[PDB]
Amino acid sequence: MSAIGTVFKEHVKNFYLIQRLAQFQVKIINHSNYLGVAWELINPVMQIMVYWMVFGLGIRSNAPIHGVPFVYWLLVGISMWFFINQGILEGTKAITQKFNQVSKMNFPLSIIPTYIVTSRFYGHLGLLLLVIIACMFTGIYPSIHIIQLLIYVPFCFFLTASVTLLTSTLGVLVRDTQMLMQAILRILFYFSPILWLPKNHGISGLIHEMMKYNPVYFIAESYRAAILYHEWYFMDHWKLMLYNFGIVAIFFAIGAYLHMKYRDQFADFL
Amino acid sequence: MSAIGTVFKEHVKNFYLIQRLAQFQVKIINHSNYLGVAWELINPVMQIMVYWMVFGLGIRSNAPIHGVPFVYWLLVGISMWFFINQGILEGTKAITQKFNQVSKMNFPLSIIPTYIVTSRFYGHLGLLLLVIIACMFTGIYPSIHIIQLLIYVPFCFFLTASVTLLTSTLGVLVRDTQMLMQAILRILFYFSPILWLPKNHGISGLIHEMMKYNPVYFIAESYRAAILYHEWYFMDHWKLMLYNFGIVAIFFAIGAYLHMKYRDQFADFL
Amino acid sequence: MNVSVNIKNVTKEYRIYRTNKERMKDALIPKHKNKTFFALDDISLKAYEGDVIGLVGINGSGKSTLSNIIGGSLSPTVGKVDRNGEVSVIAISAGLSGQLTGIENIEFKMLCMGFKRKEIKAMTPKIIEFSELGEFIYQPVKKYSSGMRAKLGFSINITVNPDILVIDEALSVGDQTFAQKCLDKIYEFKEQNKTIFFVSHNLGQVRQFCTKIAWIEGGKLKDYGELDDVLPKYEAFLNDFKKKSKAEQKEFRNKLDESRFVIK
Amino acid sequence: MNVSVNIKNVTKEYRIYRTNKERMKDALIPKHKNKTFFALDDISLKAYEGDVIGLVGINGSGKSTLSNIIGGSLSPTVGKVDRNGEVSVIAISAGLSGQLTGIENIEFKMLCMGFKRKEIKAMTPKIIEFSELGEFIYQPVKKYSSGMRAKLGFSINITVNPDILVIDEALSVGDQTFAQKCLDKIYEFKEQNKTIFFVSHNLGQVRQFCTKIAWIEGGKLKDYGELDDVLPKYEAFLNDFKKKSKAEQKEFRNKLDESRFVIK
Ligand SMILES: CCCCCCCCCCC(CCCCCCCCCC)(CO[C@@H]1O[C@H](CO)[C@@H](O[C@H]2O[C@H](CO)[C@@H](O)[C@H](O)[C@H]2O)[C@H](O)[C@H]1O)CO[C@@H]1O[C@H](CO)[C@@H](O[C@H]2O[C@H](CO)[C@@H](O)[C@H](O)[C@H]2O)[C@H](O)[C@H]1O
Ligand SMILES: CCCCCCCCCCC(CCCCCCCCCC)(CO[C@@H]1O[C@H](CO)[C@@H](O[C@H]2O[C@H](CO)[C@@H](O)[C@H](O)[C@H]2O)[C@H](O)[C@H]1O)CO[C@@H]1O[C@H](CO)[C@@H](O[C@H]2O[C@H](CO)[C@@H](O)[C@H](O)[C@H]2O)[C@H](O)[C@H]1O
Ligand SMILES: CCCCCCCCCCC(CCCCCCCCCC)(CO[C@@H]1O[C@H](CO)[C@@H](O[C@H]2O[C@H](CO)[C@@H](O)[C@H](O)[C@H]2O)[C@H](O)[C@H]1O)CO[C@@H]1O[C@H](CO)[C@@H](O[C@H]2O[C@H](CO)[C@@H](O)[C@H](O)[C@H]2O)[C@H](O)[C@H]1O
Ligand SMILES: Nc1ncnc2c1ncn2[C@@H]1O[C@H](COP(=O)(O)OP(=O)(O)OP(O)(O)=S)[C@@H](O)[C@H]1O
Ligand SMILES: Nc1ncnc2c1ncn2[C@@H]1O[C@H](COP(=O)(O)OP(=O)(O)OP(O)(O)=S)[C@@H](O)[C@H]1O
Ligand SMILES: [Mg+2]
Ligand SMILES: [Mg+2]
């Protein structure tokens, strides 16, 4: 119980340091590019264009889903994936790379992955704003149901932060985890409603049941319900919310316990 | 014409140095892992398992193609993609990262990407041997048509080396190319017969015609013909071979010209 | 007359593996016999307030391990370190990034160091004036020469005010026109009665600056006492080592290394 | 009495950008006026065979740029460098990787350096014996102390035999018991009549080792001639600089920096 208290205290006291270091990292990454920080938004747009060309025109010839054009359906569904993928990939190696600089300075070591994640949360917020503006240009306008984002958007950040908090310690102790993460990320990507709805195309007794255990399913469906279908998602899907909250709590507790156990020996393992 | 001669002479004289530096890089990359260099083969196997689970059981429920089980069809088709992807991704940043160490030593600067590519060619060869052994275990045994590999396998290496030779100089001069390469790699991956045959599933007047301009199409089809269908591929597809050879020559010439033009100023741009 | 750092039976051991199979077996098998290297072995010294201590020894003696154990970055295998007051370490290369400019690097390093924003806003102009970079403070650090980068690092680092200070071969930085300012700044720390640990191979600076001397040979503490009594012994041993023949030097090194390597 | 390096009107300019918009405009617009910084300006010196030359100056003078231009790593903006014979540079950190062990690092650095396999196989035992690492030669370099790593780098680098040699603050490495061997090895190069360029701030070593002195101030060559005639002037200027008040030092630095920065 002391682990959770220590990590919580560190984060709630070093919020501002987290934000400042995230901004500095964003500046560092895109230093040599002529366009600068615009690539954080340019790259996801090109990737989304490729994904729509492949999975939108080839498989289904751009047939509308639920009365919404497929382009906007995919746009709302996929606006979150880049943040999760980049955060989980980059923050797993955060402690390994950034320990040397801050080893000899009195530093709260549990906030290293969090600002790595924030450096991508910035681009996610920008992409979400762009997507909302485009959907408004289509003819779909916001309603009172848009206020569910204040609850749904922080959940994605908390999930990514907890997963990264566990995986950073695991990667520091054993270096095979960083190589093993790629297949798991691919599994999470393909077994989700981001690109397709398997109910119409194929059977739903087996494929759909496994999809419900994937948090990306819940996140994408909640965003679509808040932005597109104009409904209260928690009215009929509260059990999924409870299960996801339990998953987040379990991940946070395990990561905090491991980090508190092995922080003083991080020099030997590195 | 002096550019081609200089690059050709450098490579044909520093073959052995290329091999030795490739082995050293392979040793460097996997130093901290408990399993060591086994990950170069473990990771592609897990990725192939995920790809077969998604694109083999979901889309088509593991229906055989051309009388061959889909698992071996995919295995032969996809055994090359990891090499091309990793080589093109990593060798684009070869000169940027490795120039400082060898700047003050008399070094042939045109061989830096080639050993980066060789470090992945090793794993490609291992995977190809494993795939052939598995296909033999199935009940498909080699014939006189397996000797086409001596012509087809070097072509993949030459294509990757030429593309990397151009992209390394382009990335050194302008740093946006390294960010732009990802979407192009995804386009090359999805518009290829590695995972599916669009002729049966959908229309073939439009999708199939574009696929024929992709070199990955030719490489995968040639490997499948040499290993699985037991036929001389060049008998009815010589025009595709000529077009691919022309593409390779064009890429090599352009890369050599640019590298010879801008080698002495590589310090200012870096 | 109060202790500032108290060290009791500090030991540091590292396991030596030749092949990956040995490491894998050591990790998996519960009880396994492997080679063990003693970086330090049973070091105990008590430091009082206001005492400047210089660490002297040959290459590989174990001075940096002791300094890192005192500074808290490293953890002893056996024993404890009892200290009072904050500890600061002087290292110029820690927080400087080539992509960030000088102004951005100042804020980055001061933030990672542990200072609040309001203090940084006040201390920035003094650092800028002390560094003497000029117009190049706006340029990226990657464009700097080595001396300019070292001067910027020293200017950022000199702002600390700890109870215990650890320095490592950083008494002066830059050309002759800049070393005097660094020497005066370092001496200012001495006049404020702070415990200082100095690790260097320069005997002139050690004689000019230090008060007590600790001699470390082969991972163990040979002698601890006043400078006037200990430094002559080290100088005499250094002079003696030069007269010995190559075979005798090799024998001495082999005898020193035999005790460190053990099997357990 | 034959020239070894001949330098005529070597100039090096760098463009100074404050924001990304200025760089983008400079790249796109055909004719654009931007700030230009003169690292070197119209340097011409002729070096004969067997002449040891020491480069002296204040921080940011332009000594490393000249050494890199001579060594071929960098290219002048205007002018040419005419040289005969091969050029080798002494740099210990160039080819050492932490993941690779000492034995692997020897082969890696010697291969990147330009030696054939048969020569490496012969020269390896001499390097191993000279480094004096002992059992730790099989351990990874990341486990080494700083002194041991520097000694290994020096041992690998000392094997070169060029016509022209460039050294940069690497005359001696390690503790007192190891510096004498490095000094003898360096002197052996002097007895073989090779042109040597030495860049350092240590005036004692420059006086002991060098033959001619080149003084660089503000990107230009103040004086070129014998050590006995040039070094006293530099020492006198250094002594004079200490007596000046802070305002006068700032005025001198501003006057020096005014000529370097130009708009064109
Ligand atoms: C770079 C671009 C490359 C493009 C490559 C394209 C390859 C993909 C093809 C699309 C695909 C993938 C489904 C996606 C998987 C999602 C879950 C996986 C999750 C994994 C984690 C499903 O295709 C779609 O799905 C359904 C398949 O039936 C069907 O839906 C509805 O149909 C019912 C009508 O009665 C309806 O009653 C019911 O309500 C739905 O079922 C759709 O109409 C069909 O378009 C696979 O389909 C396969 O291919 C063909 C398609 O037709 C099809 O063969 C034939 O079809 C026509 C006779 O139908 C015929 O005319 C074609 O000549 C012929 O081809 C195959 O038999 C099918 O197996
Ligand atoms: C494909 C690859 C497959 C795997 C390959 C094999 C991997 C094996 C890794 C083993 C490992 C990782 C655990 C990872 C998380 C666990 C899973 C969680 C999963 C959750 C989803 C678990 O090792 C743990 O080490 C802890 C050390 O604190 C220790 O903790 C407790 O200790 C006290 C009593 O032991 C107790 O009083 C205290 O309170 C606890 O702190 C644990 O008891 C022990 O189990 C770490 O190994 C450790 O490494 C250390 C430094 O190398 C090493 O110590 C060094 O000490 C000296 C230095 O100065 C020197 O002598 C040596 O340098 C070395 O000896 C340890 O000896 C070794 O054990
Ligand atoms: C989203 C981003 C969009 C793009 C953003 C804009 C990017 C613009 C990049 C411009 C660029 C890249 C070309 C890339 C390949 C071309 C495409 C190929 C495609 C194939 C698929 C082309 O610049 C080329 O530079 C060459 C320099 O050799 C020059 O070559 C010929 O020069 C001679 C006569 O000019 C001729 O005698 C000789 O024989 C040739 O060598 C060319 O004429 C010139 O076009 C390089 O820019 C160059 O950068 C240099 C160092 O910064 C800079 O020189 C420096 O010189 C001093 C130093 O000491 C100092 O004064 C300054 O430091 C600077 O001045 C150049 O001035 C600048 O031009
Ligand atoms: N991670 C490590 N694993 C094994 N041995 C190590 C490790 N780190 C250091 N050593 C060894 O422990 C000994 C102590 O060396 P250090 O204390 O780091 O250097 P030093 O005593 O300060 O001497 P200098 O800095 O060269 S004057 C040396 O023999 C090192 O090679
Ligand atoms: N890439 C670059 N762009 C702009 N200015 C540079 C660049 N590289 C160096 N400079 C500047 O050019 C001048 C020459 O400095 P250097 O020659 O590298 O250092 P130095 O003259 O050897 O002095 P030291 O090494 O500190 S004793 C300095 O003012 C540098 O800041
Ligand atoms: Mg040390
Ligand atoms: Mg310099």
Numbering used by the authors:
A (entry chain C), B (entry chain A): 1 to 270
C (entry chain D), D (entry chain B): 1 to 264
Publication passage describing the model:
Wall teichoic acid (WTA) is a polyol phosphate polymer that covalently decorates peptidoglycan of gram-positive bacteria, including Staphylococcus aureus. Central to WTA biosynthesis is flipping of lipid-linked precursors across the cell membrane by TarGH, a type V ABC transporter. TarGH is a heterotetramer composed of two TarG polytopic transmembrane domains (TMD) and two TarH nucleotide binding domains (NBD). Like other ABC transporters, TarGH uses the energy derived from the ATP hydrolysis cycle in the NBDs to drive substrate transport across the membrane via the TMDs.
To investigate if these differences were a result of targocil-II binding or the choice of ATP analogue, we determined structures of TarGH produced in L. lactis in complex with ATPγS alone and with targocil-II. The structure in complex with ATPγS alone (2.9 Å resolution) is near identical to the E. coli produced protein (RMSD 0.58 Å and 0.52 Å across TarH and TarG Cα-atoms, respectively). The first, in complex with ATPγS, shows the TarH D-loop in a conformation (D-loopOFF) that appears non-competent for ATP hydrolysis. We suggest that the D-loopOFF state in the absence of substrate could provide a mechanism to minimise spurious waste of ATP when not needed for WTA polymer flipping.
